[PDB]
CSV table of C-alpha atoms and ligand atoms in Angstrom, one decimal:
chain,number,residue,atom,x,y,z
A,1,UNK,CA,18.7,187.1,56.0
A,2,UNK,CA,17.3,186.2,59.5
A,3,UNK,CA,18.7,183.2,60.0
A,4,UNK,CA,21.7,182.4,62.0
A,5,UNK,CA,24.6,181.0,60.0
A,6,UNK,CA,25.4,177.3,60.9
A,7,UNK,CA,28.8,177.3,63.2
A,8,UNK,CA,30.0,174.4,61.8
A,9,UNK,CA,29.5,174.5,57.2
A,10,UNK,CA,28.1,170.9,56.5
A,11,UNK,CA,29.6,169.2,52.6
A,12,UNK,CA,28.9,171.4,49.3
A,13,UNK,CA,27.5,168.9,46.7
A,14,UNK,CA,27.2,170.2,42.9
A,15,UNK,CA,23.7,168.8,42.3
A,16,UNK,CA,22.6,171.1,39.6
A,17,UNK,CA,19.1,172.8,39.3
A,18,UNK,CA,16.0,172.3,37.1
A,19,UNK,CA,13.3,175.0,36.6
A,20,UNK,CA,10.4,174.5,38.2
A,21,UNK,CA,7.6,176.8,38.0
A,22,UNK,CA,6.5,178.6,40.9
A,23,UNK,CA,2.6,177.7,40.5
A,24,UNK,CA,3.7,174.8,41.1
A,25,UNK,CA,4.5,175.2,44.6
A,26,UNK,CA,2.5,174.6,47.6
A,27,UNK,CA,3.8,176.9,50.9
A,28,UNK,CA,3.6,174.6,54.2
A,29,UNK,CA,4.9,177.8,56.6
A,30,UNK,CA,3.9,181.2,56.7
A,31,UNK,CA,6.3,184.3,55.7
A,32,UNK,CA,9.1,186.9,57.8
A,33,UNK,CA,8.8,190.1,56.2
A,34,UNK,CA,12.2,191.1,56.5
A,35,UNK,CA,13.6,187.8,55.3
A,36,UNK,CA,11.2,188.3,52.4
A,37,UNK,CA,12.4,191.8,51.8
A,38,UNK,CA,16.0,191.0,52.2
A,39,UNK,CA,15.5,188.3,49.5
A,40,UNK,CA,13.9,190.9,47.2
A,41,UNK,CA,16.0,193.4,47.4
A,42,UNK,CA,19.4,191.1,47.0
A,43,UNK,CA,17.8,189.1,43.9
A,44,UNK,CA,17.3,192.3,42.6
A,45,UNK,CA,20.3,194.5,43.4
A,46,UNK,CA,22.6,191.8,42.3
A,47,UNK,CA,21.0,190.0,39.5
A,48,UNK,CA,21.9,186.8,40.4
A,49,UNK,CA,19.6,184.1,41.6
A,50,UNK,CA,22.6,182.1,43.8
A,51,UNK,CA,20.8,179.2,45.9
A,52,UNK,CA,18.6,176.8,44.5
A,53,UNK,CA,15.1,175.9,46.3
A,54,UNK,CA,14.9,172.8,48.0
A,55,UNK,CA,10.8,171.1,46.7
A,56,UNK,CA,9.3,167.5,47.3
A,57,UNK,CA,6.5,165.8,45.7
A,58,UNK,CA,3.0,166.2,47.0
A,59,UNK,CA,1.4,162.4,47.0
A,60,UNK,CA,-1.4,162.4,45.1
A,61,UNK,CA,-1.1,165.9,43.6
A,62,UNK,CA,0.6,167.4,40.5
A,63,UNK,CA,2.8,170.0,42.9
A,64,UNK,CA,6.0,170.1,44.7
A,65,UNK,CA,6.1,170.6,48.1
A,66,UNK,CA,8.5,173.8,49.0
A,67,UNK,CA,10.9,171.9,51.5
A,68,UNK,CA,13.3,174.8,52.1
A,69,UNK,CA,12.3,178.6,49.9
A,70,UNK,CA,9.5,179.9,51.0
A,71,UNK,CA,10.6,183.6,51.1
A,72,UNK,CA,12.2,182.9,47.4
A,73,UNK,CA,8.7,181.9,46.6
A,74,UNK,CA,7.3,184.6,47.6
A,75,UNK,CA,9.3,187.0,46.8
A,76,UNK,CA,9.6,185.8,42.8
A,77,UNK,CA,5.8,185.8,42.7
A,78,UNK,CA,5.5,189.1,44.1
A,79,UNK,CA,8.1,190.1,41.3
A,80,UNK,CA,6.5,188.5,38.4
A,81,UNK,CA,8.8,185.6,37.9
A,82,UNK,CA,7.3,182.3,36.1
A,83,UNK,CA,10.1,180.1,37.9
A,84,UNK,CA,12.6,178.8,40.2
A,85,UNK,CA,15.4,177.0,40.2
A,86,UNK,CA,15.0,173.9,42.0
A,87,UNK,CA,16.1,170.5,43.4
A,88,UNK,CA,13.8,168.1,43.9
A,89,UNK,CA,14.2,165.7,46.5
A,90,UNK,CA,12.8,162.5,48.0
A,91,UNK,CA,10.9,163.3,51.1
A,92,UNK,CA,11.1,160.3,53.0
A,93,UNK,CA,14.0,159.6,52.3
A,94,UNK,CA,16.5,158.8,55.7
A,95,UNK,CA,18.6,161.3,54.0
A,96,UNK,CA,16.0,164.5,54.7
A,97,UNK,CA,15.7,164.6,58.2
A,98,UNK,CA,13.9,168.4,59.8
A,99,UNK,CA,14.4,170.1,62.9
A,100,UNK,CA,13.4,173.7,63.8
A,101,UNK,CA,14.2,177.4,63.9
A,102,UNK,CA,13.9,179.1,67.0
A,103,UNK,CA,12.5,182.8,67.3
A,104,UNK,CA,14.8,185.0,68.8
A,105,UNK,CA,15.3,188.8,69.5
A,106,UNK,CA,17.3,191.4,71.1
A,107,UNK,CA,15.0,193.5,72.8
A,108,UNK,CA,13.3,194.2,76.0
A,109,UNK,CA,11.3,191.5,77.4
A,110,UNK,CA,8.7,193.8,78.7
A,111,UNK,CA,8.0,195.5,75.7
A,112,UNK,CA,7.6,192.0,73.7
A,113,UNK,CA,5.7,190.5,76.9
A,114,UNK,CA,3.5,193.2,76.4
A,115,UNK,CA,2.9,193.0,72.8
A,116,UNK,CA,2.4,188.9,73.5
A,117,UNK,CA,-0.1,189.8,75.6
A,118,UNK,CA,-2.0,192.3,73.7
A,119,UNK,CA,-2.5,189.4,71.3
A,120,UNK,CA,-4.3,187.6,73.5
A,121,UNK,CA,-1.4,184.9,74.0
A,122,UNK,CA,-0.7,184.3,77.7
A,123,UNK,CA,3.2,184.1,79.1
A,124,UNK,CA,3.3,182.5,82.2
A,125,UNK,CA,6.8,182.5,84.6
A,126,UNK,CA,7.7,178.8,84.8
A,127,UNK,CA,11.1,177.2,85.4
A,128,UNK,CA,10.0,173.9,83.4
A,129,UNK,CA,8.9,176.1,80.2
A,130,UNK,CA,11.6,175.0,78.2
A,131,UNK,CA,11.1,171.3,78.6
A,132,UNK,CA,7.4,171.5,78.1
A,133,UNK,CA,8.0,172.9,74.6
A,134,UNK,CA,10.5,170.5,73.7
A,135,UNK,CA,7.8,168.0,74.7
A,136,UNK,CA,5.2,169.9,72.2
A,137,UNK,CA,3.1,170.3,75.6
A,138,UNK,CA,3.1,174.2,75.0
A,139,UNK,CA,3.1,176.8,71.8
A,140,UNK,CA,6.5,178.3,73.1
A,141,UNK,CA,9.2,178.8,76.0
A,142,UNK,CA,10.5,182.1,76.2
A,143,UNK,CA,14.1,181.7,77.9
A,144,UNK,CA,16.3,183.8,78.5
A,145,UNK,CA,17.9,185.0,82.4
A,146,UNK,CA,14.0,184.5,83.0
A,147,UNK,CA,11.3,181.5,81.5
A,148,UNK,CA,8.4,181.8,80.7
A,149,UNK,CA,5.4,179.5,79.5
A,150,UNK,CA,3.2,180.4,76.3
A,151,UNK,CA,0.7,177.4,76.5
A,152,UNK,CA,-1.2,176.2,73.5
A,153,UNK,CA,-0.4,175.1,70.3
A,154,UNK,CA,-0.5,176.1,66.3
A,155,UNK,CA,-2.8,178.8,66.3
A,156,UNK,CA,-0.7,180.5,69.7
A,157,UNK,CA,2.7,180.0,67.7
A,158,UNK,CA,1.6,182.4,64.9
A,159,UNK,CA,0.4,184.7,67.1
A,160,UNK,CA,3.7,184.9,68.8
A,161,UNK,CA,5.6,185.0,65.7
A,162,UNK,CA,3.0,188.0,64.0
A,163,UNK,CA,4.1,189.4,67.0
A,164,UNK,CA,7.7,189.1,66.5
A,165,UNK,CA,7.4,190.3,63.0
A,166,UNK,CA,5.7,193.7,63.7
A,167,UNK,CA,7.9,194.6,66.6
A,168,UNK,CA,10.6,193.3,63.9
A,169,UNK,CA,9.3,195.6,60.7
A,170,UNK,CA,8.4,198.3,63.6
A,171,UNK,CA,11.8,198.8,64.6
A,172,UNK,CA,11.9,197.5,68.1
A,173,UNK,CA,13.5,194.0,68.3
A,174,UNK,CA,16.5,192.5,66.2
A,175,UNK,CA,14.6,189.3,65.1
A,176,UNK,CA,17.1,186.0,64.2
A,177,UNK,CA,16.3,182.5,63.7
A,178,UNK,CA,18.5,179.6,65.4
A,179,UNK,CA,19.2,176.4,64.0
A,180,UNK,CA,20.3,175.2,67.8
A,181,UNK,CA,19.3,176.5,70.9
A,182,UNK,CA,22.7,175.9,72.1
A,183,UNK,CA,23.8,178.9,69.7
A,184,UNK,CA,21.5,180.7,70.8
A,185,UNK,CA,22.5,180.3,74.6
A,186,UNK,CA,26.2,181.0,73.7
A,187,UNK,CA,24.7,184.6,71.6
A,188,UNK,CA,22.8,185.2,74.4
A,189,UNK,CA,26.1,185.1,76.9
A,190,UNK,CA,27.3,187.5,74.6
A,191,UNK,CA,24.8,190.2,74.5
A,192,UNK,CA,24.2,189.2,71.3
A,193,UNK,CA,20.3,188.2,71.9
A,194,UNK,CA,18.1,188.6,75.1
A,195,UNK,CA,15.5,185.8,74.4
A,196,UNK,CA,14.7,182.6,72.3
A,197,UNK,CA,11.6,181.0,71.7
A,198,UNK,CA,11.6,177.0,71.8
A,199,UNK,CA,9.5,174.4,70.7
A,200,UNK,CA,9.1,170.8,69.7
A,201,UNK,CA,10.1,170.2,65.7
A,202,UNK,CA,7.5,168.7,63.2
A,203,UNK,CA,7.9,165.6,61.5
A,204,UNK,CA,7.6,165.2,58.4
A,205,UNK,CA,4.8,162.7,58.5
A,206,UNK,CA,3.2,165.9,60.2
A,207,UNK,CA,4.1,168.7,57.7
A,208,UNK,CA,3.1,166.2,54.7
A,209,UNK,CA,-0.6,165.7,56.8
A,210,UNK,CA,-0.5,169.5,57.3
A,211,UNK,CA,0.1,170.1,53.9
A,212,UNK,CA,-2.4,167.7,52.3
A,213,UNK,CA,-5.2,169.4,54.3
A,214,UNK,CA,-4.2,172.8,53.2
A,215,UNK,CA,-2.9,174.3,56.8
A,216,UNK,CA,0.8,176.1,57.0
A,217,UNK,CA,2.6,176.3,60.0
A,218,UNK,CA,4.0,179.8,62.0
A,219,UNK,CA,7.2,180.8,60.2
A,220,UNK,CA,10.4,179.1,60.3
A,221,UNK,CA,8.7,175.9,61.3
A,222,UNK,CA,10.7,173.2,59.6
A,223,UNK,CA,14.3,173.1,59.4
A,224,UNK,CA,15.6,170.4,57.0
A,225,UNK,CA,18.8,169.2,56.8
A,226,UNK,CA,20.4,166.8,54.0
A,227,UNK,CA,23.7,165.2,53.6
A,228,UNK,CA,24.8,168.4,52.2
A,229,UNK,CA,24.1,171.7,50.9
A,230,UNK,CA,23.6,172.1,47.2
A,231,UNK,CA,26.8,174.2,45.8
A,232,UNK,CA,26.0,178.2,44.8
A,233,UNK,CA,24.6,178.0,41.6
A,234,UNK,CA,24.6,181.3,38.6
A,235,UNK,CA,21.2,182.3,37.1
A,236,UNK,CA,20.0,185.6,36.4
A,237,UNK,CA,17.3,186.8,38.1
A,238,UNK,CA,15.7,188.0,34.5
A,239,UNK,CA,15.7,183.8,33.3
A,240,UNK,CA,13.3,183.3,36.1
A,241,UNK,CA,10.9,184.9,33.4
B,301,LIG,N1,20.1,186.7,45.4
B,301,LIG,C1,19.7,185.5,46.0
B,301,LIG,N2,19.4,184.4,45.3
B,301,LIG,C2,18.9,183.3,45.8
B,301,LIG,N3,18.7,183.2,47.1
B,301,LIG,C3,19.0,184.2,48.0
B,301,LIG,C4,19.5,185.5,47.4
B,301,LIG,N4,19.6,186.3,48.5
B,301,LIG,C5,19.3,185.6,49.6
B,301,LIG,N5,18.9,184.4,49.3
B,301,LIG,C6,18.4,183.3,50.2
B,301,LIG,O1,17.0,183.4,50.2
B,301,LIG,C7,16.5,182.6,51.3
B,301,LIG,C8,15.3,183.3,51.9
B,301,LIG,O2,14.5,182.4,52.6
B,301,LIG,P1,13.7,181.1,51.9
B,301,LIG,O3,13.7,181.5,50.4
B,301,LIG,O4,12.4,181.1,52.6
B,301,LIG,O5,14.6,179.9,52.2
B,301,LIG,C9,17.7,182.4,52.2
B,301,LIG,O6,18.1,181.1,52.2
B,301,LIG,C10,18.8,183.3,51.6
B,301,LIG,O7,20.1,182.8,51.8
B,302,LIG,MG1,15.1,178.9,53.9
């Protein structure tokens, strides 16, 4: 998929699924289409349904939260499928805590500059970009051997990432998703990447009030992290029926 795997593999846990059906789950983030796609295609090339998704309770409402399968979601739905398999966890708990992803590409800067502006988005050179996005003071810092400032908030993050994701499907950036921005700095020394995108995380008090008023977030929004990940689990992709 698009994401970057974790350098260091946190505890396996065998916590065992339950089906949950997929109408009732509520979306807090929007969609990568070829994380999407790579989902569909795998599910359905292999047969095997391998990762169970991560849902929460919705106060008040008779739906789970999707904590961590969005693309799964999706991608089922889109398929016909009734239902997931699914863990369901307590979300304010101590032990779900969430960070962030961070959009990144290997590309050329003036091409996605471009595209960023074309959008309406502005990207301002600024040495202090990055630490104004870790403070949630602007929509994104484009860093790289150069910084850059994309001031706003929400609405200016999903115009960058629509951006990213038609220069992705178009063929003209490698698009990749970091846990840390550290990783992404040592890629980047590499030649592996050219640019990230930082920002501030949510909270979870935040994607809970978000949810509740029917908003999602830009892609890739919250990353949540438990005491371990849930060991591969063995269901065909036709019992999702
Ligand atoms: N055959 C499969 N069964 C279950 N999950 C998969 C499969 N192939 C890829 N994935 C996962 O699907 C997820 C796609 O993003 P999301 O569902 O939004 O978390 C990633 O965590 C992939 O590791
Ligand atoms: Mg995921």
């Amino acid at each position: 998929g698009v994401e970057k795997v974790p350098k260091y593999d946190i505890p396996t846990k065998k916590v065992d699924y339950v089906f949950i059906e997929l109408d009732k789950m509520k979306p807090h983030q929007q969609l990568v289409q070829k994380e999407l796609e790579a989902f569909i295609e795998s599910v359905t090339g292999s047969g095997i349904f391998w990762k169970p998704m991560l849902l929460a309770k919705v106060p008040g409402e008779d739906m789970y939260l999707i904590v961590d399968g969005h693309h799964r979601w999706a991608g089922l739905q889109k398929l016909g499928a009734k239902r997931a398999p699914s863990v369901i966890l307590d979300y304010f708990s101590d032990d779900v805590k969430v960070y962030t992803w961070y959009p990144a590409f290997k590309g050329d800067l003036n091409e996605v500059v471009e595209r960023l502006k074309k959008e309406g988005l502005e990207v301002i050179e600024d040495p202090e970009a990055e630490e104004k996005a870790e403070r949630g003071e602007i929509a994104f810092a484009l860093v790289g051997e150069k910084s850059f400032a994309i001031p706003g908030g929400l609405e200016e993050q999903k115009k960058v990432s629509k951006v990213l994701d038609e220069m992705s499907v178009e063929g003209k950036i490698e698009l990749i998703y970091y846990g840390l921005k550290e990783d992404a700095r040592e890629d980047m020394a590499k030649g592996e990447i050219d640019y990230v995108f930082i920002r501030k995380a949510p909270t979870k008090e935040e994607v809970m009030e978000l949810v509740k008023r029917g908003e999602v977030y830009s892609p890739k929004t919250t990353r949540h992290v438990l005491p371990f990940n849930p060991d591969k689990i063995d269901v065909k992709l036709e019992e999702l029926f």
